[PDB]
Amino acid sequence: EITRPPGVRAHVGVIGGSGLYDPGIVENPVEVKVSTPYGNPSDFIVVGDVAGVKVAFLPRHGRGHRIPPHAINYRANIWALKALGVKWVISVSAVGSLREDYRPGDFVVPDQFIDMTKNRRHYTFYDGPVTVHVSMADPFCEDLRQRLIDSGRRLGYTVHERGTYVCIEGPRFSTRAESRVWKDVFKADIIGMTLVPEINLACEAQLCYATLAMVTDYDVWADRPVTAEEVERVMISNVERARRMLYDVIPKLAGEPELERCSCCRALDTAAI
Amino acid sequence: EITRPPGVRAHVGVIGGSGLYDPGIVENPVEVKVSTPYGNPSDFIVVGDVAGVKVAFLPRHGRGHRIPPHAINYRANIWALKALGVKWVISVSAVGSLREDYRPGDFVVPDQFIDMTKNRRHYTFYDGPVTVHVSMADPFCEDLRQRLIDSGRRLGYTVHERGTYVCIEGPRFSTRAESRVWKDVFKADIIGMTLVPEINLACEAQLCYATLAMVTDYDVWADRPVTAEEVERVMISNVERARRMLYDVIPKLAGEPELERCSCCRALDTAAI
Amino acid sequence: EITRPPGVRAHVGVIGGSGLYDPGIVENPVEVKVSTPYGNPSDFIVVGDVAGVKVAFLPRHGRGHRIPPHAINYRANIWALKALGVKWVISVSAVGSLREDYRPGDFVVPDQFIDMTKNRRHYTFYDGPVTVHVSMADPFCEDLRQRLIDSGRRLGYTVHERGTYVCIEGPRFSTRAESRVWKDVFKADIIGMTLVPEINLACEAQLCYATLAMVTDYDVWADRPVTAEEVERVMISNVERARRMLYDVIPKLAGEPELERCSCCRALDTAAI
Ligand SMILES: CSC[C@H]1O[C@@H](n2cnc3c(N)ncnc32)[C@H](O)[C@@H]1O
Ligand SMILES: CSC[C@H]1O[C@@H](n2cnc3c(N)ncnc32)[C@H](O)[C@@H]1O
Ligand SMILES: CSC[C@H]1O[C@@H](n2cnc3c(N)ncnc32)[C@H](O)[C@@H]1O
Secondary structure, three states: OOEEOOOOOOOEEEEEOHHHOOOOOOEEEEEEEEOOOOOOOOOOEEEEEEOOEEEEEEEOOOOOOOOOHHHOOHHHHHHHHHHHOOOEEEEEEEEEEOOOOOOOOOEEOOOEEEEEOOOOOOOOOOOOOOOEOOOOOOOOOHHHHHHHHHHHHHHOOOEEOOOEEEEEOOOOOOOHHHHHHHHHHOOOOEEEOOHHHHHHHHHHOOOEEEEEEEEEEOOOOOOOOOOHHHHHHHHHHHHHHHHHHHHHHHHHOOOOOOHHHOOOOOOHHHHEO | OOEEOOOOOOOEEEEEOHHHOOOOOOEEEEEEEEOOOOOOOOOOEEEEEEOOEEEEEEEOOOOOOOOOHHHOOHHHHHHHHHHHOOOEEEEEEEEEEOOOOOOOOOEEOOOEEEEEOOOOOOOOOOOOOOOEOOOOOOOOOHHHHHHHHHHHHHHOOOEEOOOEEEEEOOOOOOOHHHHHHHHHHOOOOEEEOOHHHHHHHHHHOOOEEEEEEEEEEOOOOOOOOOOHHHHHHHHHHHHHHHHHHHHHHHHHOOOOOOHHHOOOOOOHHHHEO | OOEEOOOOOOOEEEEEOHHHOOOOOOEEEEEEEEOOOOOOOOOOEEEEEEOOEEEEEEEOOOOOOOOOHHHOOHHHHHHHHHHHOOOEEEEEEEEEEOOOOOOOOOEEOOOEEEEEOOOOOOOOOOOOOOOEOOOOOOOOOHHHHHHHHHHHHHHOOOEEOOOEEEEEOOOOOOOHHHHHHHHHHOOOOEEEOOHHHHHHHHHHOOOEEEEEEEEEEOOOOOOOOOOHHHHHHHHHHHHHHHHHHHHHHHHHOOOOOOHHHOOOOOOHHHHEO
């Protein structure tokens, strides 16, 4: 791919709020334009070094939270990270909780998801003539999931070690009836809007992708229903802990994901017809 | 917004079949073109007075039922009503029933919904750069719901005082397997095709929106499955009762929705980032 | 419709893999271009005779499996078959199983479906001004279903005589959490990606459409999750049996579907407003 400036490469992608990026840590940061066949990524990708590991930061909503979940150019974002050479992708996300023990301020490292989106326009990179059906039974990268859990537990933070993420379309939040389906019918644990098709595309790109979720709310279930103000406030209250985990995990990603704990790392070997 | 004729305003919107509009009641009716950034509303909006309350009538399918649910320009419709100044929106809708006691000819004033649509292309007005996530835990306007229930009970009509509306994509009707999911898995009460994204957009526009549903059929559950002919016949058989309720409720809407019984009336106060 | 070569007609459509077409059987085969208002069908339609019945073969993925499920021009495919004059449509499909007794290599003739797609862009031919809502309580053509079951049982093959097909969006395969919803919550039997909106459009076109499914895998439920390689291998291992059933059934379709066992054959009589 063409990049400007030319020649830029990276090894770990970080997708999340622009507040995760700390200019006090990242060595030799550069804003990079990475061409894609899908147009612009959400914002500049900031590439720089953390403990000698080259990181590409990409705020999925753009700086300033300009781009709501349904409007994100997921294809461009994942294509650009892959084009840079990344092997690992850490997503950081705000989620609602469907269970009392997943409390606001707790981290969750989900292991499963249920896609209830509808309007994301492209759920794949492969529209033909090579038909590709990736296996996503185990859709996250187990290597990276375990690294995230370990980091949180070493830092003394609550990090729930599993969870099913229901991805809804939004931007409006769930009705009570919908939330009861998510909680009591689907038996899901957390809820968000951005996982899908991000994760699909990451898998197809043979990336080791995992989500570090932060519970920001209990959806409809507490005294007052979730609001955007609530989500943003709680996220910003907890962003420093998310940064501590990121900067703890990244230095340990200098190597490669373990193939036998990376469901997608050879996804295309058996997926393409 | 530009209107033709210029200067037109209204206080209550009525969305439903064009047969709800009664030229024998509405004073000084005018067909109005309201510019929108989304193109044409379903039809002309007819503005006129009912007991001194200014009403804007908008047939969501167009006159003659020209526009099926998936083809409606929901954004244009709601933008136009908001641009006219409306505070209240009464939707009148035909629905199927998933429960024996919600009989054809009965009114239902739903309180919840489950969105099973997929192809409506825009589920919001807010695509950036201001990200908006409205709370829709309680998606209808309680003030108006209670007014509709009261009117029906004063007229002597059956009006079920709650219900979960499952909105399906259509235009084809549900399979038996789908209907069993709606009824037995989701525990929904009624089924229709037009609620979503109408309601989402109304909430984002800070309107007090409520649905007066008329049960027209039992979906798959009676001896013969629902047909369009059946829906239309039963609706037209009952339209006069729907008109009686409309013309009973509207005169009492000269004032404002009660903020504490209007979940969406200040939706943007905590929804925008 | 214009066709090239001109004047081509057919009585039975066959939709499935191009490997179903046997040049050793089909008399006087011709590749036909059938104009549609939706652009190109997936590939040429090959028209020829089987035991004096005129068949139109249409590989939904194209020759070479060029077109994944979400990219198929369903409208063009069904319009073209209808334009040729077909009355019957046999779909042949690979499916996953959600139940141990529906084993790889077994045929299934589903009777129901649950549409979990989202990105197919058009779910109907009718976008106005004639609004059409077809009844699909019983979405397959019972006449043809029973013919397929009979053929399999006469050939000595396992053919499950009912089933609920959950149609997912793809192209990625289901997560374990999703598969548990399909199996344990929706109580579905098989899973695929191509049924919808094919079946909707066939019903609207007043065709007698039925699916001959071949189980190729157990989705997430066996020791290793489904892969595309697995599906393709098992399908190609079993294609000859599918051909035997096709060439056994087709000669018996010289006449018309029985109206009282064809839910869609007069669909438009009560569907159009
Ligand atoms: C900042 S408010 C919007 C964000 O909240 C996240 N999220 C947090 N809580 C919830 C919830 N209860 N339901 C859905 N998404 C949620 C979503 O992924 C979205 O981008
Ligand atoms: C006039 S026939 C079509 C209309 O029927 C309404 N409706 C009535 N009964 C049902 C039903 N059983 N399922 C879905 N929509 C229904 C829908 O919102 C649609 O616009
Ligand atoms: C050839 S691999 C892709 C095909 O597998 C079919 N299919 C087979 N098994 C499954 C499964 N487990 N889930 C979904 N689709 C499946 C789909 O309809 C698709 O076109």
